[PDB]
């Protein structure tokens, strides 16, 4: 095992445009086999990286900036992580397929990275919903932390684990007057748990434990928990900071793992933002939950802690209780950087402003059948991906989605295109719902905590609760998706199409 806090936190560079005008910013990003050392004491690791980087370069845009990214694939024809060929059914398609989803993007459908819009190297082969090489991101939306990652059908868990993640920030100039910490004092933190072999190579399980020899090989697993935690591509790093306010864009880019984060001296975060942008009012927190694909925009105020080492800790376990010596640790702040200037940043209470009729109320169930080989298959509302679309909201209208979770565990559910408000959660009789299909509540409705009073696009639906959210669908119409963000679930098969229609 590996010494904690011996490597500096990398901060990914900001991508430079290939061409740029008042009217159009044009970027190129090529997926490439690359080599990077993840820890002082590990041989370098072979990974897949956007422009040869892990994590991918940070992309920074203004609200309404007219952006194009040509996402290209220049990867090997053959994968280096275990492909389970039995999970989706078929001329022969390439083994390695990729497509980039801008998670949180208010995006035209053919630029949203639909799982069947995939492509292989140089776009030689393309999936049946592919339309275009150069994706278009108009960024007509709230300033926020987005992130980009692969979304290829049956492969998402693999392609992401391989290293295909990156941050995308939307800056709204109108927010500049809040004087939030910025520039060097505004730092994204992409958290990814990994398991790494002694020779430096990524370990990803090629079967669950106790593989009955009937079971395919490789076989998909229903969950992955990495032995090590990385932030921005380094195992358990440290970051030297100035004793002053910092903003952090915290992103869970892990396959399965949920984090429950705190500072080991009992100190407080200030949440200024959720997936969908600034909260209306800032919230003071001692801890916070962070499931796959969630994003918390926070301030940590180091002013009074000059000289100190503060650990960003985690108490959520993955497949067992946290281990204090390993996954209980995320990174270490060292407040030893001299101030480069006066800290003019603020941490205001007042951040943003907070009339619509309900067109429809979709009731949706989270549940799993079981396959030929005994393995669990997780399904949204009893459907497989390939079944005729059923979630078909009307452009311009508002729906309430009530998501019922009678499973053993939490699912972070994500809708593309939209961000949405959270209404409440409410517990119910699980046995009763499974026996009869009948829903009896065992307690009142609970509103969201303040963290979740703003806009969200990825939301934890806890076991034995009904969660209700509300979304207005637009401004674009077309074919999108919704799904669980635990990638091991997403790929088998907790993802469905979502058509937003127009007369």
CB of 141 to Cu ion, least distance (A): 13
| N- to C-terminal Cα separation, the chain | 60
CB of 307 to Cu ion, least distance (A): 41
CB of 136 to Cu ion, least distance (A): 16
In whole angstroms, give the CA distance from residue 367 to residue 461: 12
* Residue (331 or 495) nearer to Cu ion, CB: 495
* Residue (4 or 411) nearer to Cu ion, CB: 411
In whole angstroms, give the CA distance from residue 259 to residue 486: 13
Q: Which stretch binds Cu ion (CB under 5 A): 42-50, 99-107, 351-359, 439-447?
A: 99-107
CB of 434 to Cu ion, least distance (A): 18
CB of 502 to Cu ion, least distance (A): 21
**C-beta separation of 132 from 115 below 8 A:** no
Q: Which stretch binds Cu ion (CB under 5 A): 102-110, 153-161, 245-253, 326-334?
A: 102-110
Residue 10: both structure tokens together:
């990398």
Cβ neighbours for 163, distance < 8 A, ≥ 6 positions apart: 34, 47, 48, 49, 54, 55
* Residue (157 or 411) nearer to Cu ion, CB: 411
Helix ranges (H only) for 384-442 are 430-436
Could you say which of 9, 221, 313, 484 contacts Cu ion (CB under 5 A)? Answer: 484
Residues 392-411 that bind Cu ion (CB under 5 A): 411
* Residue (326 or 472) nearer to Cu ion, CB: 472
Could you say which of 36, 97, 103, 194 contacts Cu ion (CB under 5 A)? Answer: 103
CB of 98 to Cu ion, least distance (A): 14
245 binds Cu ion (CB under 5 A): no
489 binds Cu ion (CB under 5 A): yes
Closest CA to 460 of 500, 395, 421, 412: 412
The DSSP annotation for 58-90 comes to BEEEETT--EEEEEEEE--SS-SS---TTSS--
CA 138 to centroid of chain Cα atoms: 21
In whole angstroms, give the CA distance from residue 428 to residue 466: 7
Phi, psi of 245 (to 5 degrees): -80, 140
**C-beta separation of 299 from 347 below 8 A:** yes
CB of 1 to Cu ion, least distance (A): 30
Q: Which stretch binds Cu ion (CB under 5 A): 100-108, 225-233, 236-244, 350-358?
A: 100-108
* Residue (416 or 468) nearer to Cu ion, CB: 416
471 binds Cu ion (CB under 5 A): no
Which long-range contacts does 81-85 make (Cβ < 8 Å, 24+ apart)?
81/158, 81/161, 81/162, 81/202, 81/204, 82/158, 82/204, 82/205, 82/206, 82/207, 82/218, 83/155, 83/158, 83/218, 84/154, 84/216, 84/218, 84/219, 84/220, 84/492, 85/216
Total residues contacting Cu ion by CB under 5 A comes to 6
CB of 99 to Cu ion, least distance (A): 11
* Residue (258 or 332) nearer to Cu ion, CB: 258
117 binds Cu ion (CB under 5 A): no
* Residue (10 or 104) nearer to Cu ion, CB: 104
Closest CA to 168 of 265, 94, 84, 67: 67
Residues 133-192 that bind Cu ion (CB under 5 A): none
Q: Which stretch binds Cu ion (CB under 5 A): 8-16, 95-103, 188-196, 331-339?
A: 95-103
486 binds Cu ion (CB under 5 A): yes
Residues 408-447 that bind Cu ion (CB under 5 A): 411, 416
Instruction: List interacting residues with Cu ion (CB under 5 A).
Output: 103, 411, 416, 484, 486, 489
């Amino acid at each position: 095992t590996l010494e904690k806090f011996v490597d500096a936190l990398p901060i990914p560079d900001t991508l430079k445009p290939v061409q740029q005008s008042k009217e159009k910013t044009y970027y190129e990003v090529t997926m490439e086999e690359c080599t990077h050392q993840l820890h002082r004491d590990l041989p370098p690791t072979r990974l897949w990286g956007y422009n040869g980087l892990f994590p991918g370069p940070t992309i920074e845009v203004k609200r309404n900036e007219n952006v194009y990214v040509k996402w290209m694939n220049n990867l090997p024809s053959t994968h280096f992580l275990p492909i389970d060929h039995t999970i989706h059914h078929s001329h022969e398609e390439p083994e390695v397929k990729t497509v980039v989803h801008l998670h949180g993007g208010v995006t035209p459908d053919d630029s949203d990275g639909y799982p069947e819009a995939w492509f292989s190297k140089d776009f030689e082969q393309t999936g049946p919903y592919f339309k275009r090489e150069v994706y278009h991101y108009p960024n007509q939306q709230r300033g926020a932390i987005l992130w980009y990652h692969d979304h290829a059908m049956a492969l998402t868990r693999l392609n992401v684990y391989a290293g295909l993640v990156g941050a995308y920030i939307i800056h709204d100039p109108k927010e500049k007057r809040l004087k939030l910490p910025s520039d060097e004092y505004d730092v994204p933190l992409l958290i990814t748990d990994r398991t790494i072999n002694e020779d430096g190579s990524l370990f990803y399980p090629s079967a669950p434990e106790n593989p009955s020899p009937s079971l395919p090989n490789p076989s998909i697993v229903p969950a992955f928990c990495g032995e090590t935690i990385l932030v921005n591509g380094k195992v358990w790093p440290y970051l030297e900071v100035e004793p002053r306010k910092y903003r952090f864009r915290v992103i869970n880019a892990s396959n399965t793992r949920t984090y429950n984060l705190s500072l080991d001296n009992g100190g407080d975060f200030i949440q200024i933002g959720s997936d969908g942008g600034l909260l209306p009012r800032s919230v003071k927190l001692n801890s916070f939950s962070l499931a796959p694909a969630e994003r918390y925009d926070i301030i940590i105020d180091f002013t009074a802690y000059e000289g100190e080492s503060i650990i960003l800790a985690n108490s959520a376990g993955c497949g067992g209780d946290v281990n204090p010596e390993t996954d209980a640790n995320i990174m270490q702040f060292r407040v030893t950087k001299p101030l480069a200037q006066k800290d003019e940043s603020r941490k205001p209470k007042y951040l943003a402003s907070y009339h619509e009729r309900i067109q429809n109320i979709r009731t949706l169930k989270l549940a799993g059948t079981q396959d030929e080989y005994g393995r669990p298959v997780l399904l949204l509302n009893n459907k497989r991906w390939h079944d005729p679309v059923t979630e078909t909201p009307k452009v311009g209208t508002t729906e309430i989605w009530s998501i019922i979770n009678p499973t053993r565990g939490t699912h972070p559910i994500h809708l593309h295109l939209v961000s949405f408000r959270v209404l409440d959660r409410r517990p119910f009789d699980i046995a009763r719902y499974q026996e009869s299909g009948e829903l009896s509540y065992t307690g009142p409705a609970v509103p969201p905590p303040p963290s979740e009073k703003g806009w969200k696009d990825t939301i934890q639906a806890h076991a034995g609760e009904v969660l209700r959210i509300a979304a207005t669908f637009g401004p674009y119409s077309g074919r999108y998706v919704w799904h669980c963000c635990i990638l091991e679930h997403e790929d088998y098969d907790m993802m469905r199409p979502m058509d937003i229609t127009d007369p």
